[PDB]
Nucleic acid binder design. Structure first.
Lengths: 234, 234
DNA sequence: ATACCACTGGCGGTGATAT
DNA sequence: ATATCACCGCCAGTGGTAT
C-alpha cells in the first residue's frame, strides 16, 4: 500500500466523466497528452494517469484542464467545483450562486457532522445530485430517507417515505413548526418535526406508528426540501 | 539546503503576514490554536508551525483561514489570492444547456391537449421557482396532485401523496415503467404508472387499495421528477 | 496554552517502456 | 500516439516532549 495505488471510487467517477470529454475535444482544437503537459507547467507524464485514474487530480490542475477543455468543471467534476467555489468566498465575501450549486447525498449516516469540520468528500460519495434552483448551502447536503420516521399516515399533511430526499443544511435557524434533524446518544440521527408542546421541545414524526422524543436533544440543521431520486426512471 | 527546508523570500514571509494579523484578532473571536488544529482537520504541531515560515501554504487551507480569521487571503497572501482567483474562471464558464428556472403550477384540467400542438392559457399566473436536470424543451409543466391515486401503501417504494409536486415532459419516450399522466374521452385524468401485462397494457394506481384500469384511452405526457413545494417547509 | 523538533506516506511528478 | 509499469524526490502534516 506504499507499493500500489488505492484511490477511492468517486475519485474514479470524476476522472471518467473527464476522460469521455477529452475524446471529443482534441478533435476540435488538435490536442494530445504531451500538448496539455506543455500548456501549463509540466510533462505528459501522468495526464492520462488522471483520466484513467492512475494518479488523482489536483483541483488546481483540474482548473487548468477544464480551461483547456474549453469547458467548466461540473461537467467532469462537481465536488471540485464546490471546493474551488468555496476557496473563493475566502477573497471577496458573497455567494453569487448564479445557476447550479452542488452538494452531496453521502452514505446515510452522520459523517462526524459539523461544528468540527467535515473530512471533505469523506468516506461517502453517492455521486451527489443537485438542481431545483437552490438557496444558501453553507454546509448543506441531500439525504435519502430510510427509516420511516415520518411517513404521513396515508394522505395527511406532508410525507417522507423511503428513498426520498431531504436536504440537511446545518448552518440553519431551527424553530418550532419547522422540519429538521437532531443528535442523540453521541451517534444517532433522526429526521423529525419540531414542536413546542405544552411549551417544550419535541420531536414527532408524521407517523403515529411511532413515538416522540422530548432536555438532552440538540438540533443540528434545517432540512430545506425534498426532490425524490431519478432512479424513478430506468 | 534541501536536506532541510527550501527558502524563498515571499515564498516565506506570507505566513508572517498571517501570524502578524493573527495575534491581534486571535482572542477576539474565541480561538486558541488547538482551535485551528481542530476545525481544520490536522494536528497542532501541524497547524502551529506553518506560520513560522516552516511551511508554505498550499492554495487550499489558505482559503480556510479567512472564513475563520475574517479576512481575504490577499489580506495576507495575494501570491495565493492570485492563485485561487484564476480557478474560478475555470468554474465561471457560461449559461450552459441546463436551466435558469422553469415550468408553472396549474389547476389540472386541459393541459392544452397535444391532439394538435397543445394551445394553453386561461389565467396566466402561477408563482413557480425551482428547476431540474433541464428537459421540457417543448410544452412540459409542473403538476399538483390531490387524490390518493399514488400514495404507496404506508411502507413502500415510490409514493406521491397529496399536493406534492411533479413534472411532465411528453416530448420524451414515455413507456411502461415510467410514471405518466393520462386521460380518456379527452376529458378525464387520475393518472397512474404504466405496465406490461399480457392481453393489452394498463395503468396501476400505486395505491393497490385502488381499482386499476386500462384502446379508447390515451397517454399524453410523461413524469420524470417530483419534489415538495418550497414553502411546505419554512 | 504555543512554540519547537526527527521523523514519514502516499500524491505529485518524470522518463523510459509494449499495444 | 495511446495505456503502463519500477522507481525517487518531496513537502504538508504528526506524536511526543516544553514552555
Amino acid at each position: 500500500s506504499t507499493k500500489k495505488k488505492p484511490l477511492t471510487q468517486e475519485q474514479l467517477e470524476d476522472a471518467r466523466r473527464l476522460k469521455a470529454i477529452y475524446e471529443k475535444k482534441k478533435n476540435e482544437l488538435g490536442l494530445s497528452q504531451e500538448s496539455v503537459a506543455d500548456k501549463m507547467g509540466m510533462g505528459q507524464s501522468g495526464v492520462g494517469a488522471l483520466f484513467n485514474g492512475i494518479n488523482a487530480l489536483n483541483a488546481y490542475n483540474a482548473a487548468l484542464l477544464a480551461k483547456i477543455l474549453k469547458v467548466s468543471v461540473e461537467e467532469f467534476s462537481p465536488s471540485i467545483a464546490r471546493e474551488i467555489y468555496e476557496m473563493y468566498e475566502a477573497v471577496s465575501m458573497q455567494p453569487s450562486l448564479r445557476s447550479e450549486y452542488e452538494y452531496p447525498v453521502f452514505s446515510h449516516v452522520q459523517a462526524g457532522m459539523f461544528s468540527p469540520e467535515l473530512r471533505t468528500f469523506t468516506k461517502g460519495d453517492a455521486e451527489r445530485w443537485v438542481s431545483t434552483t437552490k438557496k444558501a448551502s453553507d454546509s448543506a447536503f441531500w439525504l435519502e430517507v430510510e427509516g420511516n420516521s415520518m411517513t404521513a399516515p396515508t394522505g395527511s399533511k406532508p410525507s417522507f417515505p423511503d428513498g426520498m430526499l431531504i436536504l440537511v443544511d446545518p448552518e440553519q435557524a431551527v424553530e418550532p413548526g419547522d422540519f429538521c434533524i437532531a443528535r442523540l446518544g453521541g451517534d444517532e440521527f433522526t429526521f423529525k418535526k419540531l414542536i413546542r408542546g405544552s411549551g417544550q421541545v419535541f420531536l414527532q414524526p408524521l407517523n403515529p406508528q411511532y413515538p416522540m422524543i422530548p432536555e438532552s436533544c440538540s438540533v443540528v440543521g434545517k432540512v430545506i426540501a425534498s426532490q425524490w431520486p431519478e432512479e424513478t426512471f430506468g
